[PDB]
Design a protein around this ligand. Structure first.
Ligand code: CA
Ligand code: CA
Ligand code: CA
Lengths: 330, 190, 183
């Protein structure tokens, strides 16, 4: 396999977009499963959102090529031509033209078989009305939850980029909406199905007070975009790269954040009644794996929704259905 | 788009509210169909002024004038005769007074075929009967002799007011109702 | 002019502002005090405007099935299953179908029958609406729901609607009858 000039990402030579362009028949003929769908809303005139930043972490070289999640973008073709110049060096990428609200488009990409669907909007906020600004992201989220996929529905994994935090009310039901409630407390944010740019505004502080904590963030969330890569990009050539020295390839081993289930496997033991603490220890000790939190079902006794728990107490009780966030070297 | 939001916001607050929404373009009606709680069976509806307008106009191509028949039928209006108004305008105005209403047929209609029930309504009750709810539920328009009135069948009528249509509910057959001033019809002893 | 006409050709106009109805016709005594439904072009059926639909909000709250009766007549039979099929984004699918479903190829239509010639002509010469209603339903399975009468008699082509006229209402041999018919 080929990699970029710093070896941090999987890479391929350029290509014209028509190599990655597909119609509905081609999309549904291709064996799309465990993939990522990007539902992109744009006009041909809209500002570039920089989808390179979405694709690039999903191509970090610490993944084997066979475990790279293939990616399909559903959205406006003329907008995607303008952006393609940045995307063209990433492998296993596809484009399907037309609205993400069109249920045929969604059905043709096997939306029910994705590992996540990302709803993202690129259209302008030059729109005066704070209720209408997210109407496509809300309608798309609801539309996907209403479909049926018999040989489903609200079981498909979604994340929605909101443009106005207060529109979070409409993403979900059985959740007791109240506009007094700041975004981080709302059920969609606690479940991880709703992101909004406002939760980043503290990063200004964190920089002044701990620059290296932002560099820790930047290295995790980008998958390893070093200062040398943004220097190489600033040279205006785009990502150069090809088969690389084993030397640099050494950095093909980095810590990733990952999810391990306590349902079956060595750690299952701790699942049946154990307490977090035990797991932390057993894991670090035997597998070299830090545990940093849990992703627990909200309902037990029956919806599919789960919620995050950052670094729970040592004596915190586990369930056999829990998933554990971990940092792992392989 | 604004009205779809509202509908989303209302249903987000409580699912079981019957929502009736006005839409100005059919191409948007779909969106609503996806809202995870629009349930046509529950009552939600979407009057689409495009679908209806163009529709009426279409019917007028197959039967000229219909669109002015129906539009008058679905708006409440009392008849108001005056001086200074031509013969044709008085005939038209009397027609505009009538509206569509719906009511349960009395026990006297039981096992009548629909055509003789409608004949009975026009001749004795002074009401025009178009259609019936048939029990699962369905609506039948001018059904033939094959269809018979079951107990508590709901009918759809054209009449001058809701006070007129109640005669089809109180009508007690030959047990009471044999006098020609229809006004007489009122709730019988048994 | 269409010589080998003119005001004899059938028209319907969708107006965007109801008060512009004044200009559609002559010999009609225009007055902006007059609400649309009373104006001659609306009474003749040559003028439609979206404002006459605004009562449908009420009718729904107070009788949902009366709107479903409207929706089934005016669409020719667009059922909830068709708008579900359209919402799937494929467009209208369809091809030769089961006789089964084809059964629904029999529905009531609104239609116009003239009393000038034909079996019903009899009632035309002096009869009264009532008689027709009865004869029709009885012999043909046809409800009569109104008349489309000439405005002028003695001479323009314009006709006007009469919803459900009285039983003793006199007919003319030139009248046309709105009917619901199964075939
Ligand atoms: Ca909510
Ligand atoms: Ca009335
Ligand atoms: Ca005029």
């Amino acid at each position: 396999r080929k990699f970029d000039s710093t070896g941090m990402f999987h890479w391929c030579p350029d290509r014209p977009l028509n190599d990655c362009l597909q119609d509905r028949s081609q999309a549904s003929a291709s064996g799309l499963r465990n993939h990522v769908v990007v539902c992109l809303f744009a006009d041909a005139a809209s500002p570039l959102i920089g989808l390179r930043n979405l694709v690039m972490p999903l191509r970090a070289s610490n993944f084997h090529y066979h475990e790279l999640k293939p990616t399909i973008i559903v959205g406006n073709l003329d907008y995607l031509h303008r952006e393609w110049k940045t995307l063209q060096n990433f492998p296993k990428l596809s484009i399907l033209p037309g609205s993400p609200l069109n249920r045929a488009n969604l059905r043709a990409v096997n939306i029910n078989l994705c590992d996540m669907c990302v709803i993202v909007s690129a259209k302008d906020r030059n729109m005066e009305d704070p209720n209408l600004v997210d109407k496509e992201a809300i309608l798309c989220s609801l539309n996907i939850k209403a479909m049926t996929f018999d040989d489903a529905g609200a079981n498909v994994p979604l994340i929605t980029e909101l443009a106005n935090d207060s529109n979070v009310q409409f993403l979900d039901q059985d959740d007791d909406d109240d506009p007094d409630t700041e975004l981080y407390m709302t059920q969609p944010f606690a479940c991880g199905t709703a992101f909004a740019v406002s939760v980043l505004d503290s990063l200004m502080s964190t920089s002044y007070f701990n620059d290296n904590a932002l560099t820790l963030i930047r290295t995790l969330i980008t998958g390893g975009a070093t200062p040398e890569l943004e220097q190489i990009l600033a040279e205006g050539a785009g990502m150069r790269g090809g088969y690389c020295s084993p030397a640099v390839l050494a950095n093909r081993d980095r810590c990733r954040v990952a999810q391990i289930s306590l349902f079956d496997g060595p750690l299952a033991q701790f699942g049946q009644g154990g307490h977090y603490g035990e797991l932390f220890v057993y894991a670090l000790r035997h597998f070299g794996i830090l545990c940093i939190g849990l992703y627990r079902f909200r309902d037990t006794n029956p919806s599919s929704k789960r919620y995050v728990i950052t670094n729970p107490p040592e004596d915190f009780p586990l369930l056999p259905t829990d998933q554990v966030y971990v940092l792992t070297y392989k | 788009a604004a009205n779809i939001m509202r509908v989303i916001s209302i249903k987000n607050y409580h699912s079981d509210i019957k929502v009736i929404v006005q839409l100005l373009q059919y191409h948007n009606k779909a969106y609503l169909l996806n809202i995870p709680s629009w349930d046509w069976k529950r009552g939600d509806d979407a009057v689409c002024v495009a679908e209806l307008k163009l529709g009426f106009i279409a019917q007028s191509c197959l039967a000229p004038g219909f669109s002015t028949l129906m539009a008058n039928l679905f708006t409440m209006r009392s008849y108001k005769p005056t001086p200074e108004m031509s013969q044709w305008q008085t005939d038209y105005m009397r027609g505009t007074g009538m509206e569509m209403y719906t009511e349960y047929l009395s026990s006297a209609f039981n096992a009548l075929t629909f055509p003789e029930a409608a004949e009975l309504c026009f001749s004795k009750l002074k009401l025009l009967l178009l259609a019936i709810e048939v029990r699962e539920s369905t609506l039948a328009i001018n059904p033939g002799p094959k269809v018979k009135i079951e107990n508590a069948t709901q009918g759809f009528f054209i009449a001058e007011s809701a006070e007129e249509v109640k005669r089809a509910f109180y009508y007690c057959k030959n047990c009471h109702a044999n006098v020609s001033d229809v006004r007489q019809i009122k709730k019988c002893k048994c």
